[PDB]
């Protein structure tokens, strides 16, 4: 509360570490469905159904331009990528399986790096 603060958690490496995690996600073999925005002209249903599209390239640009105020807003956008994928894709599809794998991969790096 006013003039009463918890001890300062060192956040000065967060930007660098989120960039490293993002690099690792970008270079994973199962990243291909997620590297670029879904083409809203070419994929019927996507525009209407997926209210907030998100992809690794868009996260990378937001990261590089100071549009994440903190590491939690970064994790929200990464998880959005996978939540969108589950909304639109059957679990038993290549893309559906990619999304499960990438979420698992991300969540371990996240825990190992920050928790």
Curated annotation (Swiss-Prot):
Signal peptide start and end residues: none
Subcellular location: Nucleus
Start and end residues of each Bromo domain: 9-113
Tissue: Expressed at varying levels in several tissues, whereas a smaller transcript was expressed specifically in testis.
Cited function: Regulatory subunit of the ATP-dependent BRF-1 and BRF-5 ISWI chromatin remodeling complexes, which form ordered nucleosome arrays on chromatin and facilitate access to DNA during DNA-templated processes such as DNA replication, transcription, and repair. Both complexes regulate the spacing of nucleosomes along the chromatin and have the ability to slide mononucleosomes to the center of a DNA template. The BRF-1 ISWI chromatin remodeling complex has a lower ATP hydrolysis rate than the BRF-5 ISWI chromatin remodeling complex.
Subunit structure: Component of the BRF-1 ISWI chromatin remodeling complex, at least composed of SMARCA1 and BAZ2B, which regulates the spacing of histone octamers on the DNA template to facilitate access to DNA. Within the BRF-1 ISWI chromatin remodeling complex interacts with SMARCA1; the interaction is direct. Component of the BRF-5 ISWI chromatin remodeling complex, at least composed of SMARCA5/SNF2H and BAZ2B, which regulates the spacing of histone octamers on the DNA template to facilitate access to DNA.
Similarity-based family: Belongs to the WAL family.
Name by which UniProt lists this protein: Bromodomain adjacent to zinc finger domain protein 2B
UniProt organism field: Homo sapiens (Human)
Residue window of the full protein shown: 2054 to 2166 of 2168
């Amino acid at each position: 509360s006013m003039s009463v603060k918890k001890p300062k958690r060192d956040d000065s490496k967060d930007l660098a570490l989120c960039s490293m995690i993002l690099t690792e996600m970008e270079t994973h073999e199962d990243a291909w469905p997620f590297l670029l925005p879904v083409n809203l002209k070419l994929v019927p249903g996507y525009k209407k159904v997926i209210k907030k599209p998100m992809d690794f390239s868009t996260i990378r640009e937001k990261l590089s331009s100071g549009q994440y105020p903190n590491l939690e807003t970064f994790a929200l956008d990464v998880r959005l990528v996978f939540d969108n994928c589950e909304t639109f894709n059957e679990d038993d599809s290549d893309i559906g399986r990619a999304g499960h794998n990438m979420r698992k991969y991300f969540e371990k790096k996240w825990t190992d790096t920050f928790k």
